[PDB]
């Protein structure tokens, strides 16, 4: 196993070198709108939409995230949007969505990612109710490796939740969103994230570091295994009080190993939280709840998945909602050119 972890260290050193190369010289304008056939709208957001499209020459299906530059600026999301694209075009890991193309025009920013028809973990989790612990652990293991990877690049993730995780056709996870991801060596202070997933030190407006991602992993494992998150209420303010309280109630069916893992991840004191101790991520990888987990095998996608969303065709949209279909507006005049020069 000790040879396995010298291997892990050499891998991360190689990945940091490769990431910094693409990080320091990002790809730009690697396709254009006319290259795709629009099929259907898969989601809407305050400053854009996601569309299922098909590459004309290739025939491959893609999720195309289209952001209105004017609204990005209005809602003060410039830094987040430039970061999402710069990060995605530079990272390379099995459980991250794959950015294939990006480009911009007078009005919009476009990011084009391989289409995952299974959709979001969120809807499967809510329909099924909860996942069994082996099922939950298979997903968790992939987030653990993914955070090891991102953290080795000094990237804090800050956006973990079932909404931002896809289940692909082999039943493995793809992490979707990087708008809140930031390269940070020590602490940062932006109040961002989702109420249910916020670590106590975020809520308390003290600086915080990568330990907030290990907190969020605890929330995610809990929500997956229980069917509801550990801290919920009618209003966000009531959630925050529960989070900082230091108390969590576990369902009666949670194993003793799972409870002990979660107490160490949902540790309100970040200096005592697993993932942030001397041994770092190994305290998690070496915890008894993960004794049966073949980390090498997970990375290699060799473990058989406990759930494969029904294969209904590579352009199926059944796992996404229906939205009113609207034109993609492109002005005859360039908008916000300076804000998005690096895109």
């Amino acid at each position: 196993k000790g040879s396995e972890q010298e291997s892990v260290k050499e891998f991360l050193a190689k990945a940091k070198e490769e990431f910094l190369k693409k990080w320091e010289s990002p790809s730009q304008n690697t396709a254009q709108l006319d290259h795709f056939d629009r099929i259907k709208t898969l989601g809407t957001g305050s400053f854009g939409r996601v569309m299922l499209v098909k590459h004309k020459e290739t025939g491959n299906h893609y999720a195309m995230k289209i952001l209105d530059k004017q609204k990005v600026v209005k809602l003060k999301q410039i830094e987040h949007t430039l970061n999402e694209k710069r990060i995605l075009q530079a990272v390379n890991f099995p459980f991250l969505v794959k950015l294939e193309f990006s480009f911009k025009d007078n009005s919009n920013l476009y990011m084009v990612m391989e289409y995952v028809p299974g959709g979001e973990m969120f809807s499967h989790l809510r329909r099924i109710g909860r996942f069994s612990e082996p099922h939950a652990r298979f997903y968790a293991a992939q987030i653990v490796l993914t955070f090891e990877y991102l953290h080795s690049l000094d990237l804090i993730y800050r956006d973990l939740k079932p909404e931002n995780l896809l289940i692909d056709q082999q039943g493995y996870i793809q992490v979707t969103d990087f708008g809140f991801a930031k390269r940070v060596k020590g602490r940062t202070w932006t109040l961002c994230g989702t109420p249910e997933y916020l670590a106590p030190e975020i809520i308390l407006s003290k600086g915080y570091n990568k330990a907030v991602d290990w907190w969020a992993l605890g929330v995610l494992i809990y929500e997956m295994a229980a069917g509801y998150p550990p801290f919920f209420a009618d209003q966000p303010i009531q959630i925050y009080e529960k989070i900082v309280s230091g108390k969590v109630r576990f369902p009666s069916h949670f194993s003793s190993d799972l409870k002990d893992l979660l107490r160490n991840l949902l540790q309100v004191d970040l200096t005592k939280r697993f993932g942030n101790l001397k041994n770092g991520v190994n305290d998690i990888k070496n915890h008894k709840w993960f004794a049966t987990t073949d980390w090498i095998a997970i990375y290699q996608r060799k473990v058989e998945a406990p759930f494969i969303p029904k294969f209904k065709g590579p352009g199926d949209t059944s796992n996404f909602d229906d939205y009113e279909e609207e034109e993609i507006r492109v002005s005859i005049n360039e908008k916000c050119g300076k804000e998005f020069t690096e895109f």
């Binding site: 909404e163 989702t194 109420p195 509801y228």
Partner: peptide
């Protein structure tokens, strides 16, 4: 049950950042 309380909280749908 706690799940019933959850399916009563109004926070069972996709959760926005904030």
């Amino acid at each position: 049950t706690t799940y019933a309380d959850f399916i009563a909280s109004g926070r069972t749908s996709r959760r926005d950042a904030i």
